[PDB]
Structure formats: C-alpha cells, structure tokens
Write a protein that binds this DNA or RNA. Structure first.
Lengths: 60, 246, 105, 72, 50
RNA sequence: AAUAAAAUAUUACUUUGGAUAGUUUAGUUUCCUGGGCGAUGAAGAACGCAAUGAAUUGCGAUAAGUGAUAGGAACAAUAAAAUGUGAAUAUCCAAAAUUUGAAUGCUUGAAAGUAUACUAAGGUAUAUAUGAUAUUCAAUAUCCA
RNA sequence: CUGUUGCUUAUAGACGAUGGCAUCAGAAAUCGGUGUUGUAAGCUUUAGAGUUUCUUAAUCAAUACUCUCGGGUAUUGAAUG
RNA sequence: GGGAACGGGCUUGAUUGGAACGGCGGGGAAAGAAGACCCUGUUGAGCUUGACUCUAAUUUAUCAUGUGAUUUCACUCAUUUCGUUAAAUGUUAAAAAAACAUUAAAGAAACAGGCGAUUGAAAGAGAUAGACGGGGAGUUUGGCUGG
RNA sequence: UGAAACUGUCCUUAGUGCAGAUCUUGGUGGUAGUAGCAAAUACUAAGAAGAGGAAAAAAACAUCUUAGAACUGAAGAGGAGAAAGGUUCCUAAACAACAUUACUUGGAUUAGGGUGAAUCGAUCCUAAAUUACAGAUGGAAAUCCUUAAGAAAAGGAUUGAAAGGGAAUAAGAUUAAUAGUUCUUAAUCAAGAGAAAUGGUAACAUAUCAUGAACUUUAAAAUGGAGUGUGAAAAUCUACGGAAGAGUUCUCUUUUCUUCUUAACAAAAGUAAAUUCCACUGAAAUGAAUCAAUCAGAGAAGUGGAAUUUAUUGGCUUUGUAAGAAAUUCAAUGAAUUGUGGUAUUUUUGCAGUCUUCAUAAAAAUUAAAGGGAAUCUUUUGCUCGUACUAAUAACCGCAACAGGUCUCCAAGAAGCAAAAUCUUUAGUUAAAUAGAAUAACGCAGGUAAGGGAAGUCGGCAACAUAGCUCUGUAAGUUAGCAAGAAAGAGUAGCUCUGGUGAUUAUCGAAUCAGAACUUUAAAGGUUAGGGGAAUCCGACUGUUUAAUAAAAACAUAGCAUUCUGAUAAAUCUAAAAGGUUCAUUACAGAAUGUGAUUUCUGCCCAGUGCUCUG
RNA sequence: GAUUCACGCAGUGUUAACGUGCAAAUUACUUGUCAUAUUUGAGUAUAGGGGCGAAAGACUCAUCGAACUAUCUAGUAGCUGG
C-alpha cells in the first residue's frame, strides 16, 4: 500500500513501482483520500514475495 | 392596475403551445416541375391521430423524382381516404377524392380543401375537421378563380393555387356535447393554457376593467372601439349589433 | 420471510431498475437485475411480428449467430411471407399487363 | 404552514461555488454569478455597492506579479 | 452526498484539515497570544455553507 | 406589652464588574514626490509547500525558499544538522513560477475531460476582431483573345 | 421541662399543624367472628344429542350429577385473640 | 372630604405584631401595543372617473423625386410577404394491384445577363400637425363649525 | 490603597458640565431557589468496572453481562438508498464544558485509522429548455436569431437526466470500519494481434460458418390507463417419509418447535401454457369456441407441423457450476444427512383478448436486416472521478437531541371482506426535556350514575344512541337513471351430526351454502362498526379557494348566448428588431366577454351614453 | 369525472389542549376525503406598475392593496420626546 501523487494514473503507478523496486505488478487499485493524497494498492506477481520487498524498503 | 390575462398571453411563458407529441407540419409538398407539368403518385401508408387537432393526418410517401430514395410528406386526411390508396398530385391529376390539383382546373361547384392562399405556400384555407371550400368561378383573362371560404366569405385566388379534392375528415366533432369539466380539461392536452376562464366581473378592479363593487356588474358599455389600447379592450370590439336575433 | 435490499444505488422502481429475488445457500435471498422486455421485428407493409427472429435488445443481435437473426428468403427479415407473396404477384402481373397494352398493342 | 412546516423541503441548491470569485454565488438556473459577474468579462462592480468594492478589488489579494512591478 | 465532484471533495477535505487547534509547542513561543483557533466549527454547531 | 430571625442605616475587608488614572507598534487630516499593471498572461479566486502549524505570514512541484551581489556570527518553543572554507539579514538582479482567471483549440456545475500539428510520456501552437506582406483561390464584376 | 425522631402512627392532614402510644412500645402472620361472589382442581352420575371403533367393550362429546352452604377474597381506612 | 369632577401617599377619622405557606381572582383605572374607532395635518398609498395637466398604443393629412401616358391607368426597379436540395422560369428547335426504380450501356437540345412566385410605387418605419386615449403617469379635492 | 507623572496664576482655544430622550453601549438587582425539568405503556434482581448508594430508608443509583418483564408489530421504533449534511464512521485515552438531574455513556474532548470497480454509477445520447462566431437591432449596456440572413456549422453548433435510453459479474469468505470494488472459485464484454452453401411442399432450420462496397428502405432502442382470465417463481399453509437438536412431562401428549439451501454463466434426459402462421380437405342440418367474448368460402372445426413469449442460454423439473460452499448436529481439526407432492392464499412477473378518450399517451446515441451488385482457438489491454456514515421521535430543513416537514425499495403468523382495529414471530429497543414521598382544593385526559329526559342553551355545542352479516319488506317524489343501506321486522353461541357444489378410474381435495337434534349465562358488538324521519333557502352535480381567525350561498364547471378576424388577419409582449406568443395553427379555428346543469320563459323601450353604417 | 373502507391527505367542530407552547400555527378526538379536474420527486420556464392566480388582492424564501437589498439620504415634518 502506497501513497502517490493524485495526478498519476494506474498505468504510470504500475510502471513506477516496477522501475523503482524491480518487481512485477499484476493489479493496482487506487483511492483518493479526503486530504488529497491518492492511495494505491499494488499487488505483486506470485513469484515475487511482497514480504521481502517490505523488509528491503524499510517497513520491517 | 395589473396587466389583464389577455396581456399576459402575448408574452408566451405558460401560454405556449403544448406541441411535443405532434406529428409535424401538415402541408402539400413543395411545388416543382413534376407538380406543375406532370403528375406524381403518392401512397397513403397510414392514418394517424395528431394531438391538438380534430382531423386525422395521413403519411403519404412519394418517390423522389430527381434523386433515388423516398420523399415522405404529411397530408391532412380527406374524408374517405384509406390505407394503401394511391393519390396523384399535379396539373394533370384525375379529379378523384384525395388528389391535389391547381384550383384553376376544378370545374365550378367542385369541393376542395387545404387550399393555398398564395401559390407555393402549401395550404392555408379549409383545414379544420369537416370543413371545405367550394369553387365559384374562373377568370381565364387573369388566371384567377373565386372560391367560397367556410365562413361564407368570398375570396379571389390565382388559378395556380393547389388544393385537395374533397372535405376534411373528422366531421361532426363539435356536435357531441361536452358533459364533464374533466372532458373539457382533456381537450386542451395539446393546446394553450386557456381553459378555466374566470369572469372579469368576479375579479377586482386592479386585475380587470370589469372588476366591480358591491354588486357583480360591469357598469360601462361592453362594446368598445377597435382603437382601444390593450388592457382596456375587453368584451366586444367594433360590434355592429348585440342581443339575440329574431 | 427474508427481506432484501437494493444492491445498486438506484432507489426507485423504474423500468431499468427491475429486480428478481432468488434463493441461495442457507435460505439466503439475493437480488438479481432482470432485463427489460423488448419488441420484435415487424413487416414493413402490414406491421405484423415476423416469425423466426427472437425478441431481444438491439445490441444483442450482434452476439447472435449470423443465421439466427434473419429468414432465408427474398426480403426475409424485413417482410412477412405474405408481405413478399403479394410483392411477387404485383411485380409480375403489372409487368405482363402493360406488355400488351402499349408498344403497338 | 408558511413558517416551520414549509422549511422541511429545502434540500435543493440554488447557488454553488463560482470559478472566478470562489463564492457560493453561481446561480445554477440563471447560469450567472450574482457576486463577481461571471461569464461577463468585466467584473461586476457598482457605485451603490461601495462596501462590495472594498471587499474584493486590487490590493485585497496576494498581488503576486504587481508587488514587484510597483516596487521596481 | 455519496456522489460528489472531484473538486468539491478536495474542498471538503480542506475543511477537515482546517478544523484543528493550536499545537502545544506553538503555544509555548515567547509572547504568544494564540491559544485557540477561533475559526473552528462542528458539523452540528455550524454549517459551512458549501 | 415584647424579641430582633427578617428589614433598614454607616464604616472596614472580601467578592461580581470593569469606570477612573497612567500608556500606545493604531487611526484622522493636510502637504511633498510619483501615479511605475496586462496575450512576454494582469488584478482576483483555488490548491499546495515549515522536523514537529489550525489560522496568519512567505512562497510555487527548485515550496516559511534557489543562485548572484552586499552582510558579517547567529536561531530558539524543543530537538538535529550546517556555519568566518561564510549563520541570520537585504535586493528595481538572475533561474523558477501548480489549477484557474481578459482566459484565448473544444467543453466545463461542484466537470471527471478531450481533437489535431510539431518537438509512448512531457512541452509548445491552434478563440474573436484586426494592420502589413507572401500565397492559394472565387466571381465573364470591366475589358480582351 | 420542651422540640426533633420512631410506630412507612390515627379520629388529622397541601406542608406545617393537630390527636395517640413509645419496652406492659409497636409490627407481623395464623386462628375464630364478620362480609363479597356463587359450588374450585381430581375422580364418579352409561347425566348426555350423536359419530366412530371393536362388535352390541370402548373412544370423543357443549352442558349436567356426588364429593360442595364448595373454592377464592376479606382492611387496604373492619372487629377478637 | 377636597383635588384634573373615581387616592396607596394629602386632611380628618377607623384601625395596625414581625416573617410567610397553599388557594383564588376584587383592586393595583395590572401586563402585552407611540388607538386600529373619531378628529386635526396645507402627511401619504391602493382604486375609480370627461376632476386638472399629460403619455404609450390606435388613427388621419403633408413631406421625404422609380419609370410612360393633382387624379386615373400600364410596367418593375427599390420595397412588402413567402418557397425550396434557390432542382427544368421564359423563348425557340424538337384513379384496376400497399412491389422495384441508384453507382448506365452504346446519350440527357439550345439561349436569356430574372432562382421561383407575390406586392408595388401603394403599404410599413421616421418628422410635423389634428382626433381619440384611466391602458398609464403626476397632483388636487378651501375655511368657519357647542366633534 | 496606589507606584510615575503632575500642579497653581494670566491670556487663547473648544468635540467643555446630564436624572430623564421606549436615549446608545456594557454590567447588575427584585421577581426567585419561584414557574418549570408531566406527549411517545416500564422497569426489576445478581454481578463487573468506577472516587462516585451512601443510611437513624438518604425509599431514587448513569454504563456493561445474565435472568425476569416488556414496547415498535412488520404500509415497524427493522434492513437499505436519492437530496441535504461532511468525517458526524471505527478504535483507544480521557469527562473541564454540552445533551433543563447525574453520567464511567455519547452524534460531546483528544489522537490515530478507515472509503480499492473493465462488469455499480458519472463520463455517452437526447427531452422540456439553454448558450456561442458571423448577421439583425440599440444612444447605451446589451437585446434578437439557433439554422434563418453566412464563401461558417456528408449536413447542421454548445449545454441540458447519478429516476428517461445505456456493451459486459455472480456465489462464498474476509475487516475494529470497505466491498456487485478485496481474497478464492467461476464467467462475461469491447478494441486489437496471431463467380462466393445446403435442407423443408410450406411456415422455416443449420458448434462463425456458407464474401458482399457506395446508395436506399425497414425494424429495434420506443411508449397511456382500467378491469377480467391464466402460465411460472417466491413467501405462507398443508399431505406423505425420515435424519439431527431443543421444550413439556406427574396429568396427558407416537407430542410441540427449529434446519433439511444454492448464484452468475451455459447444457439439453423429460415435459408445459398461450398466441400467430404452414400443408391436406372444403363447413349449412352452420359450426368452433371464452369468465366475457370472438371467428369462418380473400376460408372454419379436424389431423400433422413451424415460429415466438414465459425474470440467463430454451419456460418448468434436471444437469455442469457444486458440495469442496453453506446450514443443522456429534467429537477432540475430524465425521453424519440434505425424498416427493397440493384441483389453497398473497406478491412478483409475463401472456391473451375486452373497454376508454373532442386525451391516442417522447427523441437521439447505438444495432440488425433487406434491395443492390462494387471489388477479387490462443493471447494483450481496459484510463479519470464517486464509493466511509445518517437518511431521521438525535447526523437533513426549521436558532436545539424541536410531538412540524422531507422522495423511494424489500415485507411473517392469528383473525376478519379487508395492507382495518388488537396480539405475537425475525430484527430493533427499554432510553429517548430528572426522580422519591403524600394521595388536599382547582385543573388536563378517559369514565359511570337513582327518577325525569333538552325543562340547559343563541343553537341537542359536548356526550349518549344506531352500527357486521342473512332473510322478508320498503313511501311520497322523480331528469324514470334514482330516492334506497328509505323507513320497519325477524335470525346469529357452543357441542354432535346430515346433505349440495369436483378430478381420475374406490381414492383424492377446496372452503362455502343449507338443514336437524342437544346444551347454556339465549350468542355481531374484546376491537372494528350507518342515528332515523317531515319540510324550507342557496348552489345544479364531481371539483377549487383567503399558507397563520372566513371552506361557504363565493370561484370553476358543462349548457346557453354575444363580438371581431381570411391568416400580410384578430388578440398582443418588446425601446427597437430579416423580433416574439396563440400558431407544428386556418372559421367544427383563433381571440374577447356575460349567464351558469335539465324543463319552462326570456316581456316593452334606440329618447340619453356607448358601438356601428353600405349613408 | 358512481357509493364506501384502508395506506396517506386536509382542516368541519370541540370555538378542547397549548397559548413566555413540542410548534413565530402544533397536538388529541370528531369530521371530510382517500386515482383521472388524482397525489407526488427532479429538471426546466415565467420577476417587480413585473410574474402567477378554478379569483381570496390570494402567492411570489416567516416580508405583499406592489418583494428583498444598496444609493439619493443625516429625505421632509407648522407634529411628539429630550
């Protein structure tokens, strides 16, 4: 789950996450919060484990 | 005072015609060479009910004489027309019921309807249900003919004015007495907003010139000049007579 | 006596808002969106509903098989079998009648 | 029933926020703004509304590109 | 309403953002008179007319 | 006839309230100098950016600020970092300048949008009227072959 | 001495007041008297029109017979103990 | 009793113990409201009308130069009113049938300086002048007075 | 007391002296611990947390759990939306203020968290209507025109509906909160990419099949209401055969109660109702048919076929989905089952004809087919925005947690004609401007009454009284339709029986009607539930009206009558206008008026004032 | 455009309650009505000597025998109060 700029669509978010972290993305769902930030739910391919990306990023 | 209801009618805000389900404009097809020096044949596809008018309307389908395709008109039904009938329009048409001919070809005593008051204007006179006009005489010197209007007045028109032979369908419409206020309410479903008419004497002096005092009356003569300004012109205008006739 | 609720955000019983209540597991009743009733094709001459063509929405005929939306006949799919028989007689008899009336009769 | 009872049906907006003045003065049916005089190009100002002139005019805002020009 | 335009929701969200009070550290600045936010409103106390 | 709970009267102290006295980084009037906006996008409106900010202030995706020039040791509510190899501070300077707005490709309600051309995305141009030049045309409008 | 208080106090009563008793105080049931209503629940009278079911035993059956002048209530503003 | 002619205060008398609870509706000429009935303002407003002075709309006469024989005629050339896909104008050559009719084989006539009718120098708009004009505008409706 | 400015004299200057102005602004008293904190049936006991039920009963105690007792009664005080609200949603800490007592409670304070779509909507189309360039008008701002005026737009510009039209998603599970949006499983749609067919007599039929350009046409999207009959599904009720669990059990009860289920999308064992066509044959002694009708020699009935509709394929049972889900039990994650019907009611949904209109009850986007003959299964993607919560006796509008107002969807049992009053089930709630004691007067709400019975009073005002169903019976008057439920009289309960109304060849099933014994407290009346008659006046009738003192004899109405107008007109808006309304019109029409159904009759007067004249 | 009941709606009577109210027009019973001249949502049109009116001078944001709002304006007062 990310927070992105509102002026980006699901297509640009999918490429951005793929390029930034070197992963594979198969589904993106976005909701724009009340403050103004767009929350993106990025689902990764089954081969790529999301738990290792979270530790690599810094969530763990 | 205020503005009388007659004044408010010329504004056209709630007094506009309720023409939404109306079929279209009922008139003759535009005059051309084939309607001036030949005949065109029309097929009466159907007969329908046009809201807001007492006469049925017929969907006639002429073939296009200059191009390829159809050319759909909307005539007014002469009494007797049926679906699938062939009607011929032109200067050489047969003198049957429903055919359209110039007013200069019909013999004296011929009954016509949907007469043009000026050549090419596609129908002015004798258009209400059950109405017609009769041919009185011809004047080949100036190519003008005399016809008797349904009001009884006599008019002079050019012999090139087209007309449809017969009488307009839906005759006897007004002979049935309206019985209920509801039936009168439904009469204006496709007409203006004018039905429930309040007597002027029942109003107040601000609203109407007839707005009376302690007894419902007019108080001044109700026969007025034609030059009366709007707002005070009510009752009878330029009346040469009044009362009942014996 | 399970009472249900509208699933979508439409709250009025319009024609496009038709619903059917069906049953599911455990006695659960859900809401199904049912389609509208559509008219069929009519003969262009007599205005009679043709036989052999289903009564479905105009876009649904695209999904139909190419042979399941028309009748294999001259003017098939736009005219009834009676609408066409009179056409053949009119086209033939009128042609024959004038073949002997003019052109050095 | 012209008082308390008749207020119950008031749930349809007449004015919404305008794009040029930011006030809830854009009339939806008239398609004009009662305050800043929308699509009319000239801003709506009247001499009888002298207080309305001192509420929104030059100098009541940031003056982003004119503060430097007059200082220069 | 449940249905709203994109611009209307962002101006709705800002009204949520501005319904806050003075942070405690700001109140401890020298020569401070700002203790409360007098531009505060509550949904059942005042309608924001928008 | 009788007591002083209540009631009334004066003084002192306390209380509710904020008059009076002292005071002013606020106003009013007159005068002096200018009277320096905008299609190179104005004034106005909206949204956003401080390590902890809701307003206000300053600013515009280079964000309570960047570079350059003067300036010389600070800031502070609490931590951090950077700092005479240059901290605050200042400027008719330079780079940058979101959505709108005369608003101007088309549409715009609180509408999310969208067409073409040039240099997938990004960035420019395309409103109306109009002066000059180039260019392609229309009218047997005047002649003429 | 007087007042408060207690008897969820009375012959009194809007509240005060007023009247009675306060350890032989008071209250409580229970018991008997005195009243009100009308014969409780259980089993018996084939009470009993009739239909079933054996076959001429049963079953079901408004209502009615005995136990029954029954049962229930009765100061709460009743009266003994 | 007198007084502004119906006192809680004044004068003369009747009479008075301080604090009050529950009621009630005689009084406080009780509260609510610069009387709304009447009158006075040289104060207004709605409405009406041959009240006075005007005005929109209506109407009539003159002016505003189309051509050829003030009026009477003929034309179109401004102009009025219409119709269309401005789709055969003008002059020469030559009701038996609810069906189809197109993208041509090897043709489908020319010319006018008018798209087609309609009106026509009349009408309409302008200026001046007479009439009409509560449809409308402004204003007025003296004083004395046993109210 | 107070802690930094101030004073006296002379001239000068003035925003220079307050008890009033219903004076302005601010603060504060008596009233006064007074009036009040009384609509919405209702709370009690044990325990827990908490400073917060103590005590000489200080008779009351907020919140949560359990038990008892209850209310809304399913057109709800239930579960969900549109507008409006805007973070009110969830959790935790905390209770200074607020919710007419109090609060550990809160829609209140503080701080975090929460709204996921190729399939739901906006986005797309047009309706009433609306706005631009050029043009026309105007002193002016600006107005007109919306395809007419145009070298503009094959044809006509912009906007306009979260209830109109519209490509495509369902079941189960999950969160403290989102879910046709997430997870699992299972699909669907769109835009891509990899001389040209048979069969049937015919109606017509073939896993894409089986070429089909310009041009033209047709159809669909797409069209009122009523009432009757009927197919199907669901809910309720019921018969048969059980499985599992629960309640009652000293009096009985083979008893009472609960569960026994299944999606989108597709398949085709079996089999329906209705309508329309096709082939054979030719109807009279006329038949066929419905509840009603209605149909036939331009052709009936009969036999045999074809097509369409019936909430996705193809309507119902059935099948894949799919039992692996879910529900009910059992055990300590693992095991058990999940038949068949009905000649019953309601709702929904189609269908079939009938009636009704001086009413005839939208358009476009988009799609298909025809006439014509020009030419020669796999895989990829599916963007922007809304999505939390209330939707109301506490989240909306009324100054408020206001007995007022505000558009909808789903809808159990009893009883009855009834979606009536009354009671209960699933769900919700017991708090919704504070309680305790006593049981005075005067009140508000609901009642009863001896004898009389309107004698009260302006007036039967208020209350009383009749009331359902069945049979008999019913006057004058009348527009011959009515009056009429006239008026008036009789019957009605419980138990035990009898007979009538059908389907299939004895069984099966429906409430309805009639009748007979016996008994009693002699029976519609717990709730619901018409007082009746004889006249007079006005309005003919159904209808509308002074929001907030007048609901009426007032207005409207159909009927009657009058006036003008040939459409370049009549009325009439605008300052003007190739401007605007009736008019998408044409005398059976448009416009302007008086009287007010039907019957009967509308008398005499043209001097005056209007109006008119061909003088 | 028949008679009635029901969901709803209105406002005939009590000239009941309340009348510093639940409410700047509400409550209870009673009454009338409860689908075609019907009820109702949204969109849209009509604006101040104007609009709309089955006509009460009714309605046009608690404002109507001429709305609200700002300017002329500190309108004028032989009249009232200080």
């Amino acid at each position: 789950v990310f927070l992105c700029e509102q002026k980006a669509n699901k297509t640009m978010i999918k490429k951005a996450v793929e390029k930034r972290y070197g992963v594979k993305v198969i589904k993106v769902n976005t909701l724009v919060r009340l403050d103004g930030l767009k929350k993106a739910f990025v689902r990764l391919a089954p081969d790529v484990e999301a738990m290792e990306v979270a530790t690599k990023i810094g969530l763990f | 005072g205020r503005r009388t209801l007659s004044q408010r009618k010329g504004r056209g805000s709630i007094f506009k015609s309720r023409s939404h389900h109306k079929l279209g404009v009922a008139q003759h097809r535009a005059i051309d060479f084939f309607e001036r020096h030949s005949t065109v044949r029309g097929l009466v596809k159907s007969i329908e009910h046009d809201p807001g008018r007492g006469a049925p309307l017929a969907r006639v389908v002429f073939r296009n004489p200059r191009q390829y395709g159809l050319d759909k008109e909307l005539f007014i039904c002469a009494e007797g027309l049926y679906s699938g009938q062939y009607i011929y329009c032109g200067s050489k048409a047969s003198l049957h019921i429903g055919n359209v001919l110039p007013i200069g070809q019909c013999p004296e005593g011929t009954v016509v309807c949907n007469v043009e008051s000026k050549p090419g204007d596609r129908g002015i006179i004798a258009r209400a249900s059950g109405n017609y006009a009769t041919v009185i005489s011809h004047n080949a010197d100036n190519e003008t003919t005399r016809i008797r209007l349904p009001s009884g007045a006599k008019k002079t028109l050019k012999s090139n004015c087209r007309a449809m032979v017969g009488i307009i369908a839906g005759g006897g419409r007004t002979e049935k007495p309206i019985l209920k206020a509801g039936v009168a309410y439904r009469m204006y479903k496709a007409k203006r907003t004018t039905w429930p008419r309040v007597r002027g004497v029942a109003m107040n002096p601000v609203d109407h010139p007839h707005g009376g005092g302690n007894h419902q009356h007019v108080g001044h003569p109700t026969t007025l000049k034609r030059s009366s300004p709007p707002g005070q012109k009510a009752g009878k205008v330029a009346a040469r007579r009044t009362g009942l006739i014996r | 006596a399970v009472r249900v609720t509208y699933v979508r955000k439409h709250s009025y019983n319009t024609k496009s808002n038709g619903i059917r209540i069906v049953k599911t597991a455990g006695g659960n009743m859900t809401v199904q969106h049912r389609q509208k009733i559509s008219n069929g094709v009519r003969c262009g001459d007599c205005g009679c509903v043709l036989a052999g063509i289903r009564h479905i929405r105009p876009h649904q005929y695209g999904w139909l098989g190419k042979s399941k939306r028309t009748v294999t006949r001259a003017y098939g799919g736009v005219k009834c079998h009676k609408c066409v028989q009179k056409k053949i007689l009119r086209a033939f008899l009128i042609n024959e009648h004038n073949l002997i009336k003019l052109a050095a009769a | 029933t012209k008082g308390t009872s008749c207020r119950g049906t008031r749930h349809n907006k007449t004015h919404i926020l305008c794009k040029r003045c930011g006030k809830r003065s854009w009339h939806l049916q008239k398609q004009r703004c009662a305050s800043c005089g929308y699509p009319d190009a000239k801003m709506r100002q009247y001499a009888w509304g002298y207080k309305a002139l001192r509420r929104r005019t030059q100098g009541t805002g940031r003056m982003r590109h004119l503060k430097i020009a007059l200082k220069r | 309403t449940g249905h709203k335009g994109f611009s209307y929701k962002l101006k709705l969200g800002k009204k949520i953002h501005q319904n806050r009070g003075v942070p405690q550290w700001f109140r401890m600045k020298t020569g401070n008179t700002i203790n409360y936010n007098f531009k505060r409103r509550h949904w059942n106390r005042r309608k924001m007319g928008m």
